[PDB]
Write a protein that binds this DNA or RNA. Structure first.
Length: 405
RNA sequence: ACUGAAACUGUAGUAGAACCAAUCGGGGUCGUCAAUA
């Protein structure tokens, strides 16, 4: 379940709620391929495809840029049937085929990806980070969103949520540089801005629709629980009753309520009447704050090949988009982009320990992007490269034209 | 005053793009209570 956020008011935009059903993570299906060869080999591009599948490079289904679609291949087997020959036709009828060791061919050619920049952000909650679960619990009103991950459940920040906060910061930077106001515009108008329509995409309305060059994974917690352990928390009726067993079990500290609550902490909030100083009862609510939930690194994928198609192959246009992306990562590392629920209400600030920039087949001028950063201000990037980007950025600022012509 | 035969409705096409489940709220605090005879 999700919602668009109005860029002026900062609140759920009216008419922009959405729901999506998803096959859970860790679900399996067969790779079900047959290839008819008309020559005595196996095609390079098909070997490259199988390498990409084993690398996890291919996305499937909807919401590819906004949380979903990542698949990886395992147990790859190749069976050969020489249908040109009697032994191979009867093998096809009877014998289940000549086995190929994939490890031989996979070693015997270099894997080539299309251009992309991986961004892996190692982060920790500086203050509790959760997405809200849509249903109130019984003991706890506001519960973390969990998702099934294999046979377990994990806490999740959907890549929809991280995408939207990053898009919001991108759009805010551009509108500042232009001193452009989105107060009058409607939500769809508020989103249409230059350089963000390519990094994040534009809705397909009849067409300015574009898929985002930038894709964000669902980020799951390093903590996991059995499904019935989390149901025990969801069903818990009493915060100091059966919730304490349930939270002790789920956090993995069944005999230490202290260590359990250093991971998942129940928190009461009360609104105080200004005239009387009384708890404005009925305005009491409770949050299960994931104060000590550890999270896997945020995986962001910039499809550099997608940007090139938008900019018509000329990589000089890439530099203003790359510049914006680095300016957004500078804000993400400086705690300026809180994530999830309750960001003005004591949650959502993150530490960024490390940004790993992992470009495959990058052009030589963006090759300085292949870096692991630990300064939040990106000074691990070569100053000549950052000045190079800074110049192309400043030129675009002077004429904030639509690169995409 | 003699049944035609034989012929794969297939071939190419990702149900997808876009959308932050979010906004506000100190876990807080002081005057009685009761109605008869």
């Amino acid at each position: 379940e999700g919602v668009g956020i109005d860029r002026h008011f900062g609140t759920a935009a009216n008419g922009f709620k959405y729901s999506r059903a998803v096959i859970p993570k860790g679900s399996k299906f067969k790779l079900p391929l047959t290839f008819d060869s008309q020559d005595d080999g196996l095609p390079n591009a098909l070997i490259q495809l199988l390498c990409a599948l084993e690398a996890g490079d291919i996305r499937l289904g909807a919401a590819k840029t906004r949380g979903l679609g990542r698949i990886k291949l395992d147990d790859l087997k190749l069976k050969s049937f020489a249908l040109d020959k009697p032994e191979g036709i009867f093998s096809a009828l009877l014998d289940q085929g000549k086995k190929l060791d994939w490890n031989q061919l996979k070693a015997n050619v270099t894997y080539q990806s299309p251009p992309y920049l991986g961004i892996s952000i190692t982060w920790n909650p500086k203050d509790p980070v959760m997405v809200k679960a849509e249903g109130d619990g019984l003991a706890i009103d506001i519960l973390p969103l969990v998702s099934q991950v294999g046979s377990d459940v994990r806490f999740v920040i959907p890549g929809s949520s991280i995408k939207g906060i990053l898009r919001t910061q991108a759009e805010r930077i551009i509108r500042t540089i232009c001193q452009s106001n989105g107060s009058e515009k409607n939500f769809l108008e508020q989103l249409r801005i230059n350089l963000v329509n390519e990094l994040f995409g534009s809705a397909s309305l009849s067409d300015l629709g574009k898929i985002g060059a930038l894709a964000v994974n669902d980020c799951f917690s390093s903590l996991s629980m059995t499904p019935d352990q989390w149901k025990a928390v969801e069903n818990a009726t009493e915060m100091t009753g059966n919730l304490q067993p349930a939270l002790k079990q789920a956090t993995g500290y069944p005999n230490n309520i202290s260590q359990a609550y250093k991971v998942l902490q129940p928190a009461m909030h009360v609104a105080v009447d200004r005239w009387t100083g009384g708890a404005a009862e009925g305005m009491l609510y409770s949050v299960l704050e994931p104060i000590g939930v550890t999270w896997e690194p945020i995986q962001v994928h910039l499809d550099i090949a997608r940007l090139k198609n938008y900019y018509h192959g000329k990589e000089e246009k890439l530099k203003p988009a790359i510049a914006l992306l680095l300016l957004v990562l500078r804000d993400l590392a400086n705690k300026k982009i809180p994530v999830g629920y309750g960001t003005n209400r004591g949650m959502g600030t993150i530490t960024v320990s490390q940004i790993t920039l992992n470009g495959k087949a990058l052009p030589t001028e963006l090759e300085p992007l292949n870096k692991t950063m630990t300064c939040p201000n990106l000074t691990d990037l070569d100053e000549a490269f950052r000045q190079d980007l800074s110049t192309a950025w400043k030129e675009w600022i002077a004429d904030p034209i639509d690169l995409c012509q």
